[PDB]
Structures are given as structure tokens and as C-alpha cells.
Coordinates of C-alpha atoms in Angstrom, one line a residue:
Chain A
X1 CA -16.0 92.5 -30.0
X2 CA -19.6 93.7 -29.6
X3 CA -21.1 97.0 -30.8
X4 CA -24.4 97.5 -32.6
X5 CA -24.4 93.8 -33.7
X6 CA -22.6 91.1 -31.8
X7 CA -19.6 89.2 -33.3
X8 CA -18.1 86.1 -31.6
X9 CA -14.6 84.7 -32.1
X10 CA -12.5 81.9 -30.6
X11 CA -9.3 80.2 -31.4
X12 CA -6.9 77.9 -29.5
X13 CA -3.6 76.2 -30.4
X14 CA -1.4 73.7 -28.6
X15 CA 1.2 71.3 -29.9
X16 CA 3.7 69.2 -28.0
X17 CA 6.5 66.8 -29.4
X18 CA 9.0 64.7 -27.5
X19 CA 11.7 62.6 -29.3
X20 CA 14.1 60.2 -27.7
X21 CA 17.2 58.2 -28.6
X22 CA 19.4 55.8 -26.6
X23 CA 22.3 53.6 -27.8
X24 CA 25.1 51.8 -25.9
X25 CA 27.7 49.4 -27.2
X26 CA 30.2 47.3 -25.2
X27 CA 32.9 45.0 -26.3
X28 CA 35.7 43.0 -24.6
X29 CA 38.4 40.7 -25.9
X30 CA 41.4 39.0 -24.4
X31 CA 44.0 36.5 -25.7
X32 CA 46.9 34.7 -24.0
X33 CA 49.2 32.0 -25.4
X34 CA 51.7 30.1 -23.3
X35 CA 53.8 27.2 -24.5
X36 CA 56.5 25.3 -22.7
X37 CA 59.0 23.0 -24.3
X38 CA 61.7 20.9 -22.6
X39 CA 64.4 18.8 -24.3
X40 CA 66.9 16.9 -22.1
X41 CA 69.6 14.7 -23.5
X42 CA 70.7 13.5 -20.0
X43 CA 71.8 10.0 -20.6
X44 CA 69.5 8.0 -18.2
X45 CA 67.0 5.4 -19.2
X46 CA 64.5 6.7 -16.7
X47 CA 66.0 9.7 -14.9
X48 CA 66.6 11.7 -18.0
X49 CA 62.9 11.6 -18.8
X50 CA 62.0 12.1 -15.2
Chain B
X1 CA 57.1 -9.3 -33.3
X2 CA 60.4 -10.3 -34.9
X3 CA 60.0 -11.8 -38.4
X4 CA 63.6 -13.2 -38.3
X5 CA 66.0 -14.8 -36.0
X6 CA 67.9 -12.3 -33.8
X7 CA 69.9 -14.7 -31.5
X8 CA 72.4 -15.9 -34.0
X9 CA 75.9 -14.4 -33.9
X10 CA 78.8 -14.8 -36.3
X11 CA 82.2 -14.8 -34.6
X12 CA 84.1 -13.0 -31.9
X13 CA 81.8 -11.3 -29.3
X14 CA 81.3 -7.6 -29.8
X15 CA 81.1 -5.7 -26.5
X16 CA 78.1 -3.6 -25.6
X17 CA 79.6 -1.7 -22.7
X18 CA 76.9 0.9 -21.9
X19 CA 73.9 1.4 -19.7
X20 CA 72.9 2.7 -16.3
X21 CA 74.5 -0.1 -14.1
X22 CA 77.7 -2.0 -14.7
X23 CA 76.5 -4.8 -16.9
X24 CA 77.7 -6.1 -20.3
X25 CA 75.2 -7.1 -23.0
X26 CA 75.6 -8.8 -26.4
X27 CA 74.8 -7.4 -29.8
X28 CA 73.7 -10.0 -32.4
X29 CA 75.4 -10.2 -35.8
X30 CA 72.0 -9.5 -37.4
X31 CA 71.8 -6.1 -35.7
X32 CA 74.4 -3.7 -37.1
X33 CA 74.7 -1.7 -33.9
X34 CA 72.5 -0.6 -31.1
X35 CA 73.1 2.5 -29.0
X36 CA 71.8 3.4 -25.5
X37 CA 71.3 7.1 -26.2
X38 CA 68.3 7.7 -23.9
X39 CA 66.9 11.1 -25.1
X40 CA 63.9 12.5 -23.4
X41 CA 61.5 15.5 -23.8
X42 CA 58.0 16.8 -23.2
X43 CA 56.0 19.9 -24.2
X44 CA 53.3 22.1 -22.8
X45 CA 51.1 24.8 -24.4
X46 CA 48.0 26.8 -23.6
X47 CA 46.0 29.5 -25.4
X48 CA 42.8 31.5 -24.7
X49 CA 40.1 33.0 -26.9

């Protein structure tokens, strides 16, 4: 504003903020159990085992 | 090996009529008895982590 005497004024304001977050988790598991048993009382010296 | 004699026999022959084919063996008097039970087996197993 200026009248009989001059007066000067000036102001400025600016602010900026940016936040960020990122997370990712991955997991994988697997289990398999296979057992085979064979008992033969056949009566041959070789063929029973064969 | 054998630490003793296994061929000696005491008296009347003891028959050993058993086996795959038709053949007659002898059992020594030192051995009480021998059988021809031919058992057989095998196993298998798997696992994963």
C-alpha cells in the first residue's frame, strides 16, 4: 500500500513433502515322503529275492 | 573260516531233503540242523525338503 509515505511488503510460502513405503514378502515350502518295503518269503534261493 | 572240523559225522546219515533241485545233501553231526528257508526282502524310501 502507498499513500502519503510509501510502505512495501512481501511474503511467500511453499512447502512440499513426499513419503514412500514398499514391502513384499514371499515364501514357499514343499515336503514329500515316499517309502517302499517288500518282504517275500517265497522259498527260492535266487528267485525269491529276484 | 571254520575254527573246527565240520566234516565228521557220528552215526546213521541224517537226510537233508530240501532245496531247489532234486538233490540230497548231508548234515554233519557238529551242526545241529540247517534249514534252507530262503527269505528275501528289499526296501525303498525317498523324502524331500
